[model samples]
Target chain A: VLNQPSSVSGSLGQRVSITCSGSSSNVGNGYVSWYQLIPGSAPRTLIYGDTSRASGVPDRFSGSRSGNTATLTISSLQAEDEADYFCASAEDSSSNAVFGSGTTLTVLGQPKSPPSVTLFPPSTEELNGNKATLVCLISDFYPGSVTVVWKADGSTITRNVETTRASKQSNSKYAASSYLSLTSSDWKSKGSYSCEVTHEGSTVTKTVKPSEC
Target chain B: QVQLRESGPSLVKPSQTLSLTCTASGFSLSDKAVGWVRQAPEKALEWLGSIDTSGTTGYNSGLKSRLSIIKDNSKSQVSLSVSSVTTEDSATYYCTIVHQETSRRGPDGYSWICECSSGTYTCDADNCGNLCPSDWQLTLHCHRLDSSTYTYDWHVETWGQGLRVTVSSASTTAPKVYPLSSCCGDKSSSTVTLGCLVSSYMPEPVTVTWNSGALKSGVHTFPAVLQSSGLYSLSSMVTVPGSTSGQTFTCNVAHPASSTKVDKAVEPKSC
Candidate 1:
């Protein structure tokens, strides 16, 4: 297989065009499709068969076919599109599926390496009614658009959260952080609170319980 | 090989304005158009607008009014400014082009003409019904007077339904509505009431009117209150009567920098 990495990064809602090349027949006659796979979410189809629109899909997702290459075009990339996008082909029998190595598209404009997250007023057991601030320290994200989401008991907290980015780092990745403040009254002390870090196609989750530091 | 890079602040305080710049190096501003896209910190990318080297501009209809794109050919730089910025505008932004060369390919052995598909209808609840005008912000709202209930359901339908309805129990019901007529011209009067109808609910409010086609203008609103099921039933009204008479009137619902407007003009009766 003469596979090559064609991974690229783009902003959300911006058009992303990925070109995949293979043997004349492999790409010319074979059906080609594109997918978006978020970390905790199921992979969804973004484009299919080089131009055939998939059912229940928006117009933003599209594809086209050239001589020996297949092109998947997503008009506006959403944060949800930050997941890995793989070009796949249907084996002749339609029972088998072949995929390109897979390209991780970092949707967030942050530097490749995001900053670490820290909890302020560190405590082992956070009691009900007490207020706390969870800080996400992200570094080296270029064209900063890093987001810090707080999850408790597996559900996202209020969607109206805040975000901030630090100055650019040596590698051109900007460092930034977001602080999420919550009152103890808002916590369901029985479960743990997790901080989910999302930048492009990569995601990291850290969970903290009432007893865990 | 030429490439374009977009640089701008990633975060803006709620209620503040956002300013961004797209700097180009390889291509001459005179030869191409530079467009802006916004991606929420971890969300999808939204097309904001575009500015050519000649200073001509084009914007996504949903965000056109609130957004302005300008270029400095001498500096080979393009800048974007969005007023009344909110948390929703917090996203990574980019600049791009609709590759001219790739778009003009011809059929084998045949002379081919490539023309942009104009006035194509969108299916989103915000851009449905009426085609979006070149520049403007369209707002939509739903409200319920019963504070005891907190649940609301809203969905936008384009093409077929050409409408977006939001049902909520909140006391405030102001969704910005940007009529597509603004893209055509400016004419207002009293004989006409921009009719806004909600078929899902019976005995609909009767006083709704169309407002100015201009962005962010003071609306001529009339206050009226009614009660339903022992609770106060309220709807906000802004009349631009003659503003839309004889002309095509549209009801638009605005989404994050995007919207759908449905045309209310009935096809003329055949003799």
Candidate 2:
């Protein structure tokens, strides 16, 4: 049977459940997992491969399964929970055989889009020997799990970036930010750098001209 | 046999201070150490501390800072004080003595002799000789006697301080005290036939009567004669009210020589 497509769309701070189906015997023992992916942040496993707990997951994310349908539930969903969630089989016999079609969960609240990456101190200024910092921010995403990538000359920049999720907003939206720092020498060569945010199959990119600096 | 009694308040409010006194009879306060314990409602017994006749005291670490154990050797009584009480502190306070056998053991053997003797020879050496040598120790077997027994006649001076006594089932060998007869006395009427008996080695000065207070009573005391082994045995009898069928009788003992009074009460019940 073709895999069933389960759609889950809800407002921030709301509860939502998604189901994943498997064969008979496998359904009884198959582990169900849930993950969160937000723009500009790393993908995180909200629910472990099994119903067991993960290291740092809040108690809000829970998992249970019945029959062929494995269910993952989120309570008091925050804006960070807006990221995509995927359910996969616990059996890891094959990478291709173990995967599941990902679901894109969107938090319906104000500021519906992720933050536009911005480099502090506009372009066209001399930054010689100074540290240049770029920040990638996303708002209204629950279960914050967004990947933020910095690229220069169409190639990925190996610069270290720090990511953090801020407290929830009044509208139940969660704000997250990622920081990338580079010494002026690294950006001296005239080139175009971009902060690419990807979640599930959706990607958003913001570009900057370091040559202008 | 010597008997000891403990009496104190039965209730203590939270944040209030708790005070208790245990007055013992038939046994001298200078002869043994008096220890205290607390039994919370539906909880296990907690050892509070102990005080020797010398006025030295030891308290549980949990209550060391807020509790004090005091002894009045002259009154044959030990008192306990606890401050800054909380709901958690509400419990029945008790005073008991460490079993003497265990305490009398010496490094070489079981020593019944006190350390203050003029000679170096211990009691074990003087009595049992080489049979209980230096390595011998005393193994104590504690069997809790009935609270009304001649063996358990400690006087409790206060009530409503949450003091209670409980005997464990493991103590099956202890004897209980029972009243044989009771009657009241009138100086004008030359006839009186009421009494209660208990094995003791101390002076008896208290009366037994019904709770109605209409029954007056008297007490009879006798000397304690030592046996061939040097242990003394004595007996005492007390008078009670004529209409005291369903009343409680108290045996009050006043040791004028030691200036101490210990009281033990027995409630009347049908056989």
TM-scores of all candidate predictions against the true structure: 0.30, 0.25
Tens-digit lDDT string for candidate 2 (B78-171): 7888886776776556555532111122232333442321222234434433423333331231122222221111111111222442222111
* Per-residue C-alpha lDDT of model 1 across residues B117-230, encoded as one tens digit per residue: 332221223333232332222122111122232111111111110011112222322232212111012122233322222111212122233323442232222212232322
Residue ranges of candidate 1 with Cα displaced over 4 Å = A1-213, B1-5, B100-271
Error of 1 at A39 (Å): 10
Candidate 2: clashing residue pairs, number: 36
- lDDT value, candidate 2, whole model: 0.47
lDDT by residue (A1-213, candidate 1, tens digit) is 214254677776578777777765345543566655443233455665466665578888788767667777777776555556666553321212345656666554433555443322212122332644443344445445566787778888885345543443334344554445456555435366666777666776766555333
What DockQ does each candidate score versus the true complex, computed on alpha carbons? 0.01, 0.00
Cα lDDT, model 1, residue A157: 84
